[PDB]
């Protein structure tokens, strides 16, 4: 065989009776999943993988953009000098897993090494028809509802250069985040509750791993440097509403090693109607939030980081929560796959 590029088709367990927007998209775009998927273990086969040069990421991006451009129409769409005022209906939003498959003549290679960084040779390789179910969860800073590392925490960088664009941290233990907009003055005020005991323990393990990659040096976290609110805050979509969460307390250096740092971390969040589209062409204004108790429980399965360059790194290495490039979100799931032609 040999490496190649081709058109992939998607698979899902969508429902035809669902008004849910991902289900509506998947019933039109994807086929029913294979009840009995077959994978073939190729004994004694070494294969090179590169998550940073994987076109599967390119295709998924097109699909997720198409999904949002078809089903998330705002009232006011502000692109250029054009002010489009259209009808904005409140929708049913909840991402469902999507499988990406190869057509006849092509097969997906799967790297099964438990400690694979995403770029290099893989000794335990299998061939599959489709990838696992991936939820198209669009988020910044924190990767939500994704997959976990099977063994150790993994630091993902292309590392052609110490000047990396994005550093993907793949967690091996999920940390629950409980974002809520309570039923009872302001209806834009929301908050995400996070267990400090678990989070600070995980974050401490993350610094421990970053030391292995950066000369065993002191790891310092810091608030984001510049940019629109979509990247200076935890940006994500919950039930159709756009949330912006101040994560300054999530990266509390003092809580990384011993006082009352455990207990519940309450992140201040707000729902904004005027947003910068991630697609992303111009701004868009949406309808005011729905009445009730808007709630989203998510699994933090990854972190997106930026290492400060041009600094004096004699004893310190400074990292800031990153993201914005939604392609990175797909790479954190597609890293172990690549398409080859028979």
């Amino acid at each position, epitope marked *: 065989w040999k490496d190649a590029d081709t058109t992939l088709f998607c698979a899902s367990d969508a429902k035809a009776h669902e008004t849910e927007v991902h289900n509506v998209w998947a019933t039109h775009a994807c086929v029913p999943t294979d009840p009995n998927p077959q994978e073939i273990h190729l004994e004694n086969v070494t294969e090179n993988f590169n998550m940073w040069k994987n076109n599967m990421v390119e295709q998924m991006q097109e699909d997720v953009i198409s999904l949002w451009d078809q089903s998330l129409q705002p009232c006011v769409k502000l692109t250029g000098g054009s002010v489009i005022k259209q009808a904005c209906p409140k929708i049913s939003f909840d991402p469902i897993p999507i499988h990406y498959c190869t057509p006849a003549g092509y097969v997906i290679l799967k790297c099964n090494d438990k400690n694979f960084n995403g770029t290099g040779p893989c000794k335990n390789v299998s061939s599959v028809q489709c990838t696992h179910g991936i939820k198209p969860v669009v988020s910044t800073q924190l990767l939500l509802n994704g997959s976990l590392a099977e063994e150790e925490i993994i630091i993902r960088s292309e590392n052609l250069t110490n000047n990396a664009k994005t550093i993907i941290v793949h967690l091996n233990k999920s940390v629950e985040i409980n974002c809520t907009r309570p039923s009872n003055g302001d209806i834009r005020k929301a908050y995400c509750e996070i267990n400090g005991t678990k989070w600070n323990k995980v974050l401490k393990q993350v610094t421990e791993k970053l030391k292995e990659h950066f000369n065993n040096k002191t790891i310092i976290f810091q608030p984001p*440097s510049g940019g629109d609110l979509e990247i200076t805050m935890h940006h994500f979509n919950c039930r159709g509403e756009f949330f912006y969460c101040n994560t300054t307390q999530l990266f509390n250096n003092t809580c990384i090693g011993m006082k009352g740092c455990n207990g519940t971390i309450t992140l201040p969040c707000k729902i904004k109607q005027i947003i910068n589209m991630w697609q992303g062409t111009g701004q868009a204004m949406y309808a005011p939030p729905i009445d009730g108790k808007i709630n989203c429980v998510s699994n933090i399965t990854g972190i997106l980081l930026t290492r400060d360059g041009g600094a004096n790194n004699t004893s310190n290495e400074t990292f800031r929560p990153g993201g914005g490039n939604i392609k990175d979100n797909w790479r954190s799931e597609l890293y172990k796959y690549k398409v080859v032609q028979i």
Partner: antibody
Amino acid sequence: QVQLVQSGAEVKKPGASVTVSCQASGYTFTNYYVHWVRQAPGQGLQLMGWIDPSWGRTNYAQNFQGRITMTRDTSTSTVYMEMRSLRSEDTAVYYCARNVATEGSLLHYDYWGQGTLVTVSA
Amino acid sequence: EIVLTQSPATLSVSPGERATLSCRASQSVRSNLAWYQQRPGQAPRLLIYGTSTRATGVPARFSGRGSGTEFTLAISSMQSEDFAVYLCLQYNNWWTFGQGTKVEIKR
């Protein structure tokens, strides 16, 4: 067809501020990081920092950490660098370069602006 | 923090002859090193990136060699246009330039 054009020459007094600009064209503006590099008389080229015009993240050098600020106007495809509390030794030509990059790594420069002369004296 | 030292500061080459410029790095920059041409009162022009890869438009007489901390830029046959300043840039860790090398016309 790629082209970077910087603003005109500026003359300022010590203790004042200044904003240099650079307008991009011929390519997708949000796909390339934009770096500001200066060259003081009788000194080598020095990088002040960069800005990713997409969202847009900024990274400054330690020597300019609290004195400079970089912004972008995605609509006009323009990158601004405001430099505050100018000193005499800030007198230099301030170039503007776009940065070639892969999907997860930042590499070299390729296209440069004509450069902006900034003169600071009493 | 990575210092690039170019030697010599000034190189005298008679037209048609070969010119060899050197760039030493204080620390290993792997292969992330690029060369630029700079004419007086003008922006730097990219010649070779990734140590030995010519930019599209650069004539074949330019070539880069060496890896690690020692680098060299070669001009097989000097033309009138080639007599300028040549800068080396590392982009392995942050971005730092060399002081440059002026290639004058030997007479």
